[PDB]
Structures are given as structure tokens and as C-alpha cells.
Design a protein around this ligand. Structure first.
Ligand SMILES: Nc1nc2c(ncn2[C@@H]2O[C@H](COP(=O)(O)OP(=O)(O)OP(=O)(O)O)[C@@H](O)[C@H]2O)c(=O)[nH]1
Ligand SMILES: [Mg+2]
Lengths: 1038, 173, 293
């Protein structure tokens, strides 16, 4: 039922509303209309506030009422009649006292309590100092009489602290927050006494824990004096840390204090550390299996370990520098370094990431002390070399353990993700920057640091690990993969000569392990690792042709292996090796009389006959790299012709048949082939580079014909049966020939190197084939990639295409614009791309925007406005980048410059403020501020024409400030003139400090959400007023 | 086979809705149509210890489409904060979301999800994502566009709620 | 002065004279360990070994109904390694001219065709599905038997001619042919293929034309005529089946392989055709399709 209950002056009940809330939280499809009505109740005001919270599944209904009350205090509080404000003060304070002194807080969930407390802080935020003077004192006294009225107060302070020091930025104006920051500081001692008294005397656990918790939020700002020049640290370590239900809060506090970046309290830190360690060695014995304690632990024994990671890591990373200089501490530091090593064995990615963060820092700190190994051989008189640098000396044996750690827990290097693309095409994707790959990166880096300080140690670690697999028989796939991952991660960290000795031993014995182990199961896992290792050391392959040769052939053999994954392994390695040894395949090696490529090319079919489609592409890409090495024109051309001979046969075949019956380019199978042929053509091009032109040219024209054939076949199918058709085999297949065709076209022009030749031959046929086709397509059939493909070519060709923008923009621009000008949702890709294109043209072909008529130009600029009004972050940002850039492009041509200002200046200014004052575009904050600042800074000189009717009477700076003031005040009439005038003035003073300019904007966004009212005037003119001129006078000073 | 209340929060365009759709339909929404208020979505996973149901309260990220914001969280039993690696702003606001949430839910298994890992030009390097550490939250790198670590957030929350560190999804009828 | 690892001996399988690697006469003469020079004796042992300990009737069904619930040694449990593969022909048979036969193979893709439950699927040696489609093979079209009538073929797929070249047959109309001498298997092919409506033609219900590969005697005079023939495809190599072989998946010396050039220098024959072993500016690219612009 509707049950709309806004009926204002109807003496409306409470038993009804109480029912809807119960549905918004329990029922189902009903909740749709339940939420749809309560969200609406927020219309007139909150007279229901009293009757509701008063009347009473009820706390939920009271929580609701509180939100309304909460909104009132954050919105119209300042323009409330004083007596009414105070009416709420007592209404809340008492409501709290009532329910905060309430015998049973938890059942009337801490939720209702917490929200109430929050509302009080909401109120304090609005008057605490000026109109609630006795507050801080009263709540202290109240705490010292009632334990209950104390515990909750410890929560009231925690919230107030967060709201003033932790979450003020954005929700509070800059100057008001400082006034609050002071107010909290000027009267904090009184409150510190309270917490302190509680800690030393209070027998009650909850009250105490909530006081330690309220303490954890204080250590973010309280004057250092309170921490290091009191008994605070001593209290936490002796009293609260040793006991179970306090060990976490206690430690988390110590951790926050251990991270102070100051050089004034060197003594306190030393004792803080050694004092903690004692407690630690009593709590968690240095001989316990920390991993088991975790594996076999709950949400208490687990967090402690995590907090231990944070404490240990944060402290050593900071004050660990001074733990070395002293001598008395040189013992507790080793104990601490011992914990980390135990903690590091915890099967838990997030904990292991924390520890690693330290190790990487340690091995880095000792790498800049000395990057070199110590001179192995002792002195003639048997003494010690000192070769060992001062600091590393202390960590020597710990470092060895850390090397063991990296070698035993090494993460997977690469991350394969199998996912089928938007076609049903199954593939293998490669992640690039996942968190996992970052873990690997750090491990590799730590071990690469340690290997430089002592590579002998590294090689010994790895030789024992490798041996234990071979006969020590701690053999398993998981470990063997880890050992070889680690081995490969240090490639190039040794002297070449050492690397040679290392590699030959390592794989020689793996080559033995693969023989003793039986079953294609084991042998494949081993062979892959061998193949991974040999793939990581091109330096070694590039010096030993015979080996390289033997490796490649082995890969060619593995390419007929039917055991799972082997063929993917063998291809990955081959492309890898080709890339890094490309030169050795095209130049004749010792012992040969013909470049290896030849053998490879005269056999492509016998090698890849058993590979899958995608693998065949990866293989073609690999040979492509070899081809790219032959710099000699003549020979590279012959190589290329034969390289593309196999795929060409299919092409040439499909083509002649299409020149007899064009219904063939409609054949499912032949279209499947045209796709794969093209896909092959795309990879070859990616590797061969520019020289590949000889190929593209050979098929460029026909390829466009078929593209257009398919593009017209698809559009018709859609026009005849609606979008739906796109969602079936043949169409999705035809889409593929189009998309790869576009990949190929753009993919080559990118790596081309003769702009003009490209603009005079490979561009004009694009017009009729791809552009006017995109034009004639039905909206649902147009390819978004057409726009992005064109964007790329503009970026490359630049000035050489500036004369074709007319012809291009015709086809795509207006027609595409009409697809994205109704709302902000439909045709996403078309939005994104279209503006990458518009960006590019404006960026590298600006002259075009001048050639066209003012009527067309306008249509372009207003399209940009349209961009930065988007809620899709990327589209709106591209719009600013364009606008910001466009403004600068205009700064060049003196003539056509002023005109722009006379016509668009104010219009653009208005539009920018339109999105600045909107709560939905807060991510363009920086770009927003940048553009404005630039425009205002421009106002003080540049614009030298009349914006107004009169002439000199109003300098642009005056008309512009008044135009803005008018626009802002007219758009936000609840603001008082002072608010606005202040703002507008800051726009010309902060015009040379974007960061400052930003804050200014952010402040105005706060004041609009609030009705400041001509009444209250708790702003800060004189203060801020001059503070703006401190910046206004930095532009002409230095 | 009992269920649980899962509240999903984050900035706009974060991919909250898109993430949920993927799970139930398997389809991927390319368009950005902002959620007004909330949209309860029941999700089901089949584990080795009986079926499990998540009531996904896909809330809104935008400020004007807020709703009964903090009001939705009540009675929650786990949560998922989500940000977009292509926009740092959506990671710097995470603290704000975790705030409102714990002031309503004092102790509930939460997960932090960095969405959009598939987009090559990632503006939020992993080195920076450390907020979960001191607040003892779980974290994962995800992509609704590639099903990368697709089911991690839910698998983890299940481990906690059913008090079993060895629960595994299987998709048995 | 360098002593580098013997990577050459790295091997996954124990397949003697594998075609996965170049001939044993190129690498190193007596090749390596898992390579032989005597294909002879093993052939006799394998043919003598001919008796039936394996249930092929039950296997064809599993292939056809994708069921591996479990209920010279064993049958591969999936779509990988179901094809009978050849070793290089090294130990040229003494009774070759009257006991062996040769099938001129085309360039393309070896596949396992499985037609059952109204559909036809082609897998690779690796068990990778390459295409699902409709066919006129007994059990491979939507108009067929939902009552135990499936087909399993060993084929080579050629792209230019969009034709699956049937190389052999291990199951037809629901009856396993594994337990049959190649002699018979081949006959059954060139006797039952052409007797299928339009199995050798392209239509909506049969997109891919199934064509049977001819075979010829291996007599001295015969091989000569073969090496100078014309085929509807480009020649890849030659297969040599011993007339008395059953069809056993995996490597076997009872069928050998050789490239066209290798023949007239491994036996003794002529060498013409196949033995030959492996203002004014410039804008120059012409189109065959020829449309508007
Ligand atoms: N490339 C890429 N895009 C994504 C991914 N996930 C979501 N998107 C896109 O980002 C936008 C996010 O849309 P939504 O799922 O509605 O985001 P939301 O969190 O629900 O936004 P609100 O409902 O306003 O809070 C959509 O356009 C998606 O197509 C992703 O993993 N990769
Ligand atoms: Mg949503």
C-alpha cells in the first residue's frame, strides 16, 4: 500500500511509520517502496522528531528520527532561534544522560547510543567554544562522579577528536577547524588528567578499555609533551600490555607513538623499546612457532601478531637507526630482529607484506652503505680485513636468514588469467600491476639487494635448496617452482663469469633430476622450470649459440607435446628468448653457414601444426622479432614475404572467391579464418615494426573492402532485427574482422616513421572505407573503436592530417554526438573514445578549429562542456584536459584570441562553477581549480577587450568579479554577501597557488550545504581576509 | 543453510553494482547508471558445508543519491568497501566509509576491494594501499570486467562467518 | 673451453623415433637414447601381441557420450591422445611391397572427429576442441539417432579446401573398428563415405566436406607413380600402414612417416615433382576485390 505519510498538518501517528521501517529492514520487494517513502519524508522539517523519539523493533525507528534531527543541526542550526538551539542542547544532553546512564546500553544497541553521542558532537561542532563554554569542564566532573557517565564520555571525546582532527578536511572550513583545533588543545590537560586518573585507579575493564581506545585516537595530535615527558609510556608497558584483553589496544598505541618522526626524545624511545621487548619475551616466548600460533588462533591471538608486525616494523624502520649506535641495546635489537624472522613464517599475505616492507628497507639501507661484497681472502697476517662495513656487520647472520626467506617463500612472478573476451573468444590475459605481482617485485628486489652484499651466500643457499630437491628429497612441485622462481629473479645480479658457473651447475642437476623422476607428470613440471630459468638468462644464451640453438629446438619439440600446459610453456619461453636474442637468429653464427631464421621459416608448418590458434599467433609474433633484427632492407624484405606466405595463401584464396560471389564474406568458416589471419597479421606487425608496410600495402585495399562488406552486413542485420542479433555467432565473428582490421591499421601507423607518406597513401582510403561507413551505419551498429583508431592516427600524424579534419569530423562528429547528447549513460565506449579523438585533434591539429566556421566551432566547444558534466570520471576529466589545453591553444594566436574571450569567456566560467558547486564532480577538484586560477590570472592582463557595454568604466577585473559574485549569489541566495565577496576576492589572490586555490573551493562547497544566515557571523574575515593577501603578495615578491 | 547481511559501500563509479551483477547474471554492465539509495540483492554460493546466502545491500556512492545512508548498515554481519585504482580520490575517501560503517557495526568481518585492476593505466599503485593494515581489514585486487579474484571477498567473509578456515566454493546443485 | 649442459636429452616421453623431433638421421646419427634404428622386431612383437584384452566397445561410447565415471595397456581417459601416431620410417620393411600401404597426407591439422548426440566435434592431439558444428556423419547432425549411433574418425583438416580428410575410422554407426586390420578399415572408408548423401559437399547441415584419403601399394613401380601424381591439396608427407595393424592410440612402428624428398633416397625412385625439397608520385598497391572506394 502507498501509505504516504508526509501529510503535514494531519495529526499523524507513529504506529504506521514504525511498520514501514520494519519492512525496510526485513521484508523484500516491499522494501523498495519502504525505502522510497522514508527517503521522501525528508521534505518539510522534523516536527515529528520529538513525537517519534519520545513515543517508544523500535530503536531502529528512533535511529531514523535521529538522522532527521542530525540533518537539522548541520543545516539550519545557525539560523535557528537561540532559545530553540538550547532547547535541543538539553534535549540531547538529557536524552544521552537518560540512555547513557541507562542500565542496559548494549541491547538498546550501542547503535542508538553512538548515534546520540554523534549528534552531540555534531552540536559541539557548531558552538562548543563560544556558546557551550563550561562543556569541557562539566563533562570531566560528571565523569568523576559517575563511572557510567564517564565511560560514555570517553566515547564522546573520541568522536570529537576524530571530527576535529581526523575528518575535518572537507566537512569543515579551513579557518573554523583551526579555531576548533586550538580550542581542543587549549583545554586538553584537564581531559588528560581524567584518562590518566582512570588508568592508574579504575578497576572497571570496559571503562578502561574505552579509555585506552579514546587514547589511541589522541596520539594523532596531542602535544608530544604528554607522551614522552609523562608516565604514559610506562603505564601502557607495565600495566596494560601484559594482560590479554588489553594487549592489542596497548600495542597499537605504542605503535602509533613509535612512529613519531622527531629528533627530540632519543632517550624515551630507547626505554620504550627495551621495556616492550621484556614484556614480549614473557608473553610470546622467542622459541614459539608463531606460524602455528596464528594457524591455530582466533580474532585475538591473530590481530596481536599483525599488530606486532606493525610495531616491530614501524619502530626499526624509524628509530632502528639509533638502536645500532648505542651498545646496551645491541642485544634487544637482535631479539627484535628474531621476532620478524618468526613472524615472517606466518602463512598470511598481509602480514608477510608488512615484514617484507622492513627487510627491503634494511637491505636497501645497507646497500647504500656499501654495494660490494667483502673481499673473501683474509689478510697475510691472519687478521680481519675490516672489509665489512660498520653497520652490515651487525646484521650479517640475520641477512643470511633473510636470503633463505626470499628463496623459500618467493612469490609467483607472472599471473596468467584466462578469460573470454567480449566475443566468446577464449584467451589468456596477462596481469601487469596486481598486488600479487607487486609482492614478487619486492621479493626479487630484496634478494637482488642481498645478493650484491654477498652473492656467494645466495648461491650456497640455492645450491642446498636445489640439492634437497634432488636427493635431500624435500621434493615437491610447490617448492621446486619456488626455488627456480627465486633463481630467475636474481638474473644479472652477479658478475657474468659467476653467473656462467652458477647456471651450468644449477640446470645440469635439474637436467639430472628430470631423468631420475618417473612419469610425464613430474618431468613436465621440471622441464618447465628448466625452461623458465634458461629464459631468464639471455646474457648466457647470447654468449653460447650452441646452447641457444639446443634450447630453441627443444622448445620446437615440446610444441608437439600433448601434456597439459607444456605447449603454453614452450611458446612463452620462445617468444621471450626471441625478443631478447633477436640478433642471433638473423646473423650467421660460428659453425653455421645460414641464419637460423631460414631453418625456422622453411619449417613453420611442421613446427606449429599441433598448436592451437592463439599459440600460433604467439609463435608468429616471436619470429616477427627476429625479422625486426635484419636491418638490411633487401634481405628483410625477402624474410617478410616468406614469413607471411602461409597466412597469405588463405587470404589470397578467400579473396578470389569473394570476387565471384560476395556472399562468401558471409560464410561462418571463411569469416572465422579472416579473423585468425588478421590476428596473425596484427602480431607480426607489433614485432616487425615499420618495415611491415610491405605486407600491409599488399592487402590494405582489399582488406578495407571486406571490412566494409561486413560492416554493411552487420548494420543491415541489426536494422532488420534490432540489437539482439549482435548476440550470436556470425555477427560477433564479423565484429572481430572489423576490430582486428582496426587494430592492424592503428597498430601500424603507431610504429610508422614517415608521416607524409602515411597521410598521402594509407589515410584517404580510410575515409570512404571506415569513416563514411561508420557514418552510414545504424546507431547500434557503429564501431566505437573506429573513433579511437582515428584518435591514435591523429596523435601520430599530427600536422600532416590537420587538413583532413574537415573530411573526418563531418562523418563521425555530429552523428556520434547525437548518440551521446540525450543522457549520460547510453553508448559508454562511444563517449570515452569520441573525446579521446576530440582531445587528439585539439591537441595536435588545433589549426583545424580555426578553419571551420564559428557555428561549427561553437558546436565543438559546447561538446566539451558536455564532457566535463559527465559522472563517468574518465569522460569528465578528458573534458577538462581538453578545455584546459584549448584555452592555452588560444593563448597563441593573438588575433583569434580576443574573439574567443569576447564570446566564450563568461560562458565557460559559468559552466565550470556549475560543476564545481555540484557534489558529484569532486574528483575533478584539482583540474577545476587549475582552469579557473589560469583564467583569473589571465584576467589581470591578457583579456584586453571590453566584456561589458560601457568601455573603460569597468576594467575586466571588476566586471568579472561582479559577474561571478552575481552568478554565485544568484545561484545560492542563502549565502550572505560577506561569504560571497570573500570567496570572489580569493579567486584573484590565490590565482598563483593551485593547492591553496583548491582549499578555497572546498570551503565554498561547505558553506553552500549550510545556511550561514545573516544572523550568526561565526566566520573569520579580518583573519582570513588578510591571510589571502599573504599569498597575493607572493606572486610579486620572490 | 542460513544467510547473512552484506553491506557494499564506496564512491560512485567504483563498480559496486557492476560487481554484484556479474555474480548473479554473469553479464558485465558497461554503462554507468548510479544507484539511488539501495538495491538489496540476494547472492548464493555453494560450499562444502552447505549453501550460503549473502543479502547484498548495494548502496549508493554519490552524495545526492545517498538515501538513509548510515541507516542501511544496521544489523549488518559483514561489509565490503570498494575503491577504483583508476581514481586515487576513491581510495582517499575509504577512511570516511569505514568510519560511518564501524560506528554502526562495531565488530564485523570487512573486506577492502581495489576494483578495475584490468585497466592497464593504474593510478593507485599497490605500494600505497595500506589502510586495511591498522584497521585489521582484509584486502584484495579485483576486476568485475575479467573475473580476477572474482570470488575472493565472498570466500573470505564465508570463512569468518561460518567459523571455518577451510570452507571452499564448489557449485554443487 | 666451454662445457655446457646436455639439454638435448631432456625428454617428456619415451616415444621411440618421435616425429616431434627431426629425423634420427640429422641430429646425430644413432641419435639419442629414446631413439632406435631397428623398427623391425618391435613390429612383429606388437602384431603377435594382437589379441583382445581391451574393451573397445565400451570406449567408443565414453568418447561419444563424454563419460569417464570409471565403472598395450590402457585407454586415454579423455579427448587427448586418441589418435594412432607414427614413428619415422627408419627400418624399411623387407616385405614392404606387398604388406604395406601408403597414404599421401595433406598439409593441415590432425584431429579426432566425434559425431554423437546430434553434434560433431573436432579435437586436436592435445585434446583441444577446435570446432563444434553440424555434419552428415551418422550422429553428427540434428536429424539423427538418439539411440546409440555414433562415429569416430581420424582426420586431417585443410583450411584452403575447408575439407576434413578422413585418414582412418575407429568407429562407424555405433560399432568399434579398432579391432580391425588397417586393410579392412581403409576399405570400409572408401566404401561407406561415398555412400553418404552429401557428406562430401558443403551445405547448411553439412558445412565441412568430408573426403576420404586414397591409399596406394608400396611396390617399387607404384611409389614412382605416386610421387608424380596430382592431389586436390598440397602434399605434406607420406604415411605407411602395415596392412595387419589394429588401431592403437599413441606411437607405433606399424605406421611410418616420411617427407616427399626422403623417399627417393631412402628406397630408390625418380625425383621430379615433390622430392624437390623446401606531376607524378609513387603509390603501388592493387586490389582484386574491386568495389566503390
Ligand atoms: N574497465 C573496467 N571498468 C569497470 C570495472 N568495473 C566497473 N567498471 C565500469 O565502471 C562503472 C561503474 O558502474 P557501477 O557498477 O554502477 O558503479 P557503482 O559503484 O555502482 O556507482 P554508484 O551506484 O553510484 O555508487 C561502469 O561503467 C562499469 O562499466 C572493471 O573492473 N574494469
Ligand atoms: Mg550501485
Amino acid at each position: 500500500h502507498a501509505a504516504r505519510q508526509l501529510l503535514d498538518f494531519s495529526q499523524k501517528l507513529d504506529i504506521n511509520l514504525l511498520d514501514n521501517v520494519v519492512n525496510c529492514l526485513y521484508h523484500g520487494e516491499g522494501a523498495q517502496q519502504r525505502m522510497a517513502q522514508e527517503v521522501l519524508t525528508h521534505l518539510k522539517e522534523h516536527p515529528d522528531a520529538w513525537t517519534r523519539v519520545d513515543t517508544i523493533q523500535n530503536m531502529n525507528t528512533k535511529y531514523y528520527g535521529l538522522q532527521i534531527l542530525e540533518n537539522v543541526i548541520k543545516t539550519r542550526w545557525k539560523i535557528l532561534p537561540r532559545n530553540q538551539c538550547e532547547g535541543i542542547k538539553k534535549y540531547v544532553v538529557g536524552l544521552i544522560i537518560k540512555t547513557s546512564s541507562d542500565p542496559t546500553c548494549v541491547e538498546k544497541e550501542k547503535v542508538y547510543i553512538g548515534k546520540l553521542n554523534m549528534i552531540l558532537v555534531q552540536i559541539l561542532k557548531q558552538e562548543w567554544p563560544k556558546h557551550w563554554p563550561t562543556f569541557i569542564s562539566d563533562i570531566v566532573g560528571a565523569s568523576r562522579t559517575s563511572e557510567s557517565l564517564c565511560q560514555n564520555n570517553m566515547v564522546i571525546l573520541k568522536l570529537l577528536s576524530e571530527e576535529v582532527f581526523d575528518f575535518s578536511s572537507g566537512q569543515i572550513t579551513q579557518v573554523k577547524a583551526k579555531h576548533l583545533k586550538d580550542s581542543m588543545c587549549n583545554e586538553f590537560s584537564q581531559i588528560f588528567q581524567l584518562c590518566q586518573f582512570v588508568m592508574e585507579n579504575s578497576q572497571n575493564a570496559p571503562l578502561v578499555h574505552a579509555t585506552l581506545e579514546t587514547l589511541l585516537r589522541f596520539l594523532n595530535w596531542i602535544p608530544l609533551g604528554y607522551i614522552f615527558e609523562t608516565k604514559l609510556i610506562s603505564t601502557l608497558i607495565y600495566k596494560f600490555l601484559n594482560v590479554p584483553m588489553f594487549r592489542n589496544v596497548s600495542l597499537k598505541c605504542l605503535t602509533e607513538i613509535a612512529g613519531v618522526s622527531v629528533s627530540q626524545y632519543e632517550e624515551q624511545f630507547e626505554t620504550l623499546f627495551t621495556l616492550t621487548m621484556m614484556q614480549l619475551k614473557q608473553m610470546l616466548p622467542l622459541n614459539t612457532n608463531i606460524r602455528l600460533a596464528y594457524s591455530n588462533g582466533k580474532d585475538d591471538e591473530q590481530n596481536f601478531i599483525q599488530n606486532l608486525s606493525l610495531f616491530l616494523c614501524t619502530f626499526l624502520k624509524e628509530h632502528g637507526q639509533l638502536l645500532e649506535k648505542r651498545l646496551n641495546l645491541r642485544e634487544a635489537l637482535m631479539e627484535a630482529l628474531h621476532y620478524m624472522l618468526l613472524v615472517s613464517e606466518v602463512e598470511e599475505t598481509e602480514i608477510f607484506k608488512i615484514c617484507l616492507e622492513y627487510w627491503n628497507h634494511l637491505a636497501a639501507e645497507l646497500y647504500r652503505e656499501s654495494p660490494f661484497s667483502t673481499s673473501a681472502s683474509p689478510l697475510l697476517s691472519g687478521s680481519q680485513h675490516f672489509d665489512i662495513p660498520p653497520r652490515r656487520q651487525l646484521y650479517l647472520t640475520v641477512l643470511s636468514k633473510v636470503r633463505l626467506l626470499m628463496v623459500s617463500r618467493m612469490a609467483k612472478p607472472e599471473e596468467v588469467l584466462v578469460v573470454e573476451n567480449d566475443q566468446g573468444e577464449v584467451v589468456r590475459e596477462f596481469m601487469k600491476d596486481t598486488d600479487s605481482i607487486n609482492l614478487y617485485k619486492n621479493m626479487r628486489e630484496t634478494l637482488v639487494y642481498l645478493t650484491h652484499l654477498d652473492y656467494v651466500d645466495t648461491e650456497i643457499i640455492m645450491t642446498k635448496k636445489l640439492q634437497n630437491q634432488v636427493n635431500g628429497t624435500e621434493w615437491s612441485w610447490k617448492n621446486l617452482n619456488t626455488l627456480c622462481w627465486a633463481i630467475g629473479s636474481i638474473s644479472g645480479a652477479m658478475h657474468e663469469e659467476d653467473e656462467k658457473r652458477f647456471l651450468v651447475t644449477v640446470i645440469k642437476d635439474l637436467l639430472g633430476l628430470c631423468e631420475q623422476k618417473r612419469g610425464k607428470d613430474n618431468k613436465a613440471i621440471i622441464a618447465s622450470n628448466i625452461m623458465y630459468i634458461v629464459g631468464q638468462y639471455p646474457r648466457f644464451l647470447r654468449a653460447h649459440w650452441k646452447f641457444l640453438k639446443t634450447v630453441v629446438n627443444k622448445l620446437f619439440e615440446f610444441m608437439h607435446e600433448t601434456h597439459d600446459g607444456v605447449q603454453d610453456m614452450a611458446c612463452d619461453t620462445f617468444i621471450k628468448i626471441a625478443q631478447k636474442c633477436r640478433r642471433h637468429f638473423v646473423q650467421v653464427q660460428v659453425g653455421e653457414v645460414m641464419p637460423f631464421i631460414d631453418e625456422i621459416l622453411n619449417n613453420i608448418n611442421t613446427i606449429i601444426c599441433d598448436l592451437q590458434p592463439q599459440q600460433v599467433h604467439t609463435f608468429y609474433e616471436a619470429v616477427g622479432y627476429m625479422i625486426g633484427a635484419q636491418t638490411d632492407q633487401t634481405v628483410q624484405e625477402h624474410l617478410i614475404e616468406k614469413y607471411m606466405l602461409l597466412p597469405n595463401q588463405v587470404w589470397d584464396s578467400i579473396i578470389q572467391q569473394a570476387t565471384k560471389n560476395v556472399d562468401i564474406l558471409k560464410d561462418p568458416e571463411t569469416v572465422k579464418q579472416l579473423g585468425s589471419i588478421l590476428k596473425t597479421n596484427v602480431r607480426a606487425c607489433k614485432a616487425v615494426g615499420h618495415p611491415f608496410v610491405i605486407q600491409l600495402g599488399r592487402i590494405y585495399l582489399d582488406m578495407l573492402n571486406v571490412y566494409k562488406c561486413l560492416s554493411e552486413n552487420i548494420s543491415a542485420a541489426i536494422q532488420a532485427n534490432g540489437e539482439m542479433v549482435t548476440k550470436q555467432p556470425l555477427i560477433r565473428s564479423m565484429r572481430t574482422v572489423k576490430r582486428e582490421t582496426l587494430k592492424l591499421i592503428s597498430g601500424w601507423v603507431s610504429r610508422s616513421n614517415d608521416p607524409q607518406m602515411v597521410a598521402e597513401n594509407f589515410v584517404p582510403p580510410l575515409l570512404d572505407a571506415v569513416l563514411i561507413d561508420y557514418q552510414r551505419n545504424v546507431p547500434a551498429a557503429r564501431e566505437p573503436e573506429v573513433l579511437s583508431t582515428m584518435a591514435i592516427i591523429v596523435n601520430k600524424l599530427g600536422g600532416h592530417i590537420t587538413a583532413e579534419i574537415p573530411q573526418i569530423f563531418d562523418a563521425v562528429f555530429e552523428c556520434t554526438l547525437n548518440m551521446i547528447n540525450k543522457d549520460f549513460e547510453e553508448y559508454p565506449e562511444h563517449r570515452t573514445n569520441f573525446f579521446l579523438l576530440l582531445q587528439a585533434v585539439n591537441s595536435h591539429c588545433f589549426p583545424a578549429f580555426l578553419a571551420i566556421p564559428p557555428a561549427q566551432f561553437k558546436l565543438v566547444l559546447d561538446s566539451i562542456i558536455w564532457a566535463f558534466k559527465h559522472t563517468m570520471r574518465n569522460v569528465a576529466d578528458t573534458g577538462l584536459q581538453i578545455l584546459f589545453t584549448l584555452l592555452q591553444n588560444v593563448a597563441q594566436e593573438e588575433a583569434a584570441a580576443q574573439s574567443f574571450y569576447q564570446t566564450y569567456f563568461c560562458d565557460i566560467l559559468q559552466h565550470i562553477f556549475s560543476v564545481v558547486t555540484d557534489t558529484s564532480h569532486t574528483a575533478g577538484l584539482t583540474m577545476h581549480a587549475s582552469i579557473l586560477a589560469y583564467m583569473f590570472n589571465l584576467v589581470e592582463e591578457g583579456k584586453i577587450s571590453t566584456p561589458l557595454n560601457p568601455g573603460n568604466p569597468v576594467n575586466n577585473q571588476m566586471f568579472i568579479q561582479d559577474y561571478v559574485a552575481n552568478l554565485l549569489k544568484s545561484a545560492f541566495p542563502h549565502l550572505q554577501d560577506a561569504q560571497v565577496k570573500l570567496f570572489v576576492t580569493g579567486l584573484f589572490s590565490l590565482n598563483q597557488d593551485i593547492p591553496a586555490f583548491k582549499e578555497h573551493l572546498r570551503d565554498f562547497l561547505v558553506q553552500i550545504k549550510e545556511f550561514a544566515g545573516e544572523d550568526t557571523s561565526d566566520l573569520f574575515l579580518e583573519e582570513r581576509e588578510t591571510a589571502l593577501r599573504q599569498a597575493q603578495e607572493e606572486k610579486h615578491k620572490l | 543453510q542460513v544467510q547473512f547481511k552484506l553491506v557494499l559501500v564506496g564512491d560512485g563509479g567504483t563498480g559496486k553494482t557492476t560487481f554484484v551483477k556479474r555474480h548473479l547474471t554473469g553479464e558485465f554492465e558497461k554503462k554507468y547508471v548510479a544507484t539511488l539509495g539501495v538495491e538489496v540483492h540476494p547472492l548464493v554460493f555453494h560450499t562444502n558445508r552447505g549453501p550460503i546466502k549473502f543479502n547484498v545491500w548495494d548502496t549508493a556512492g554519490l552524495e545526492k543519491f545517498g538515501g538513509l545512508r548510515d541507516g542501511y548498515y544496521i544489523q549488518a554481519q559483514c561489509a565490503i568497501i570498494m575503491f577504483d585504482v583508476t581514481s586515487r580520490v576513491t581510495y582517499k575517501n575509504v577512511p570516511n566509509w569505514h568510519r560511518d560503517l564501524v560506528r554502526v557495526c562495531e565488530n564485523i568481518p570487512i573486506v577492502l576491494c581495489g576494483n578495475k585492476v584490468d585497466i592497464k593505466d593504474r593510478k593507485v599503485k599497490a605500494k600505497s594501499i595500506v589502510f586495511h593494515r591498522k584497521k585489521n581489514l582484509q584486502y584484495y585486487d579485483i576486476s568485475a570486467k575479467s573475473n580476477y579474484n572474482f570470488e575472493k571477498p565472498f570466500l573470505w567473509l564465508a570463512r569468518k562467518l561460518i567459523g571455518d578456515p577451510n570452507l571452499e566454493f564448489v557449485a554443487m546443485p | 673451453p666451454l662445457q655446457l649442459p646436455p639439454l638435448e636429452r631432456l625428454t617428456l616421453s619415451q616415444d621411440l623415433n618421435s616425429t616431434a623431433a627431426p629425423h634420427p638421421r640429422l641430429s646425430q646419427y644413432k641419435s639419442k637414447y629414446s631413439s632406435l634404428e631397428q623398427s623391425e622386431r618391435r613390429r612383429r612383437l606388437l602384431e603377435l601381441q594382437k589379441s583382445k584384452r581391451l574393451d573397445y566397445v565400451n570406449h567408443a561410447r565414453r568418447l561419444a557420450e563424454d563419460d569417464w565415471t570409471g565403472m598395450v595397456k590402457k585407454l586415454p581417459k579423455h579427448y587427448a591422445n586418441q589418435l594412432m601416431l607414427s614413428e619415422w620410417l627408419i627400418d624399411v620393411p623387407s616385405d614392404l611391397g606387398q604388406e604395406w600401404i601408403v597414404v599421401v597426407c595433406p598439409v593441415g591439422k590432425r584431429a579426432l572427429i566425434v559425431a554423437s548426440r546430434g553434434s560433431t566435434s573436432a579435437y586436436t592431439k592435445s585434446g583441444y576442441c577446435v570446432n563444434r558444428f553440424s555434419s552428415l556423419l551418422p550422429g553428427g547432425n540434428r536429424r539423427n539417432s538418439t539411440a546409440k549411433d555414433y562415429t569416430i574418425l581420424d582426420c586431417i583438416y585443410n583450411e584452403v579446401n575447408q575439407t576434413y580428410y578422413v585418414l582412418d575410422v575407429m568407429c562407424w554407426r555405433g560399432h568399434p573398428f579398432y579391432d580391425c586390420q588397417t586393410d579392412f578399415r581403409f576399405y570400409w572408408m572408401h566404401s561407406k563415405l561415398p555412400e553418404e548423401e552429401g557428406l562430401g559437399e558443403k551445405t547448411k547441415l553439412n558445412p565441412f566436406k568430408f573426403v576420404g584419403l586414397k591409399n596406394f601399394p608400396c611396390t617399387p613401380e607404384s611409389l614412382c607413380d605416386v610421387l608424380s601424381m596430382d592431389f586436390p591439396f598440397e602434399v605434406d608427407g607420406l604415411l605407411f600402414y602395415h596392412k595387419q595393424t589394429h588401431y592403437s592410440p599413441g606411437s607405433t612402428p606399424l605406421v611410418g612417416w616420411l617427407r616427399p624428398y626422403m623417399v627417393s633416397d631412402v628406397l630408390g625412385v625418380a625425383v621430379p615433382a615433390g622430392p624437390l625439397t623446401t606531376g607524378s608520385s609513387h603509390s603501388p598497391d592493387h586490389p582484386g576485390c574491386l568495389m566503390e572506394n
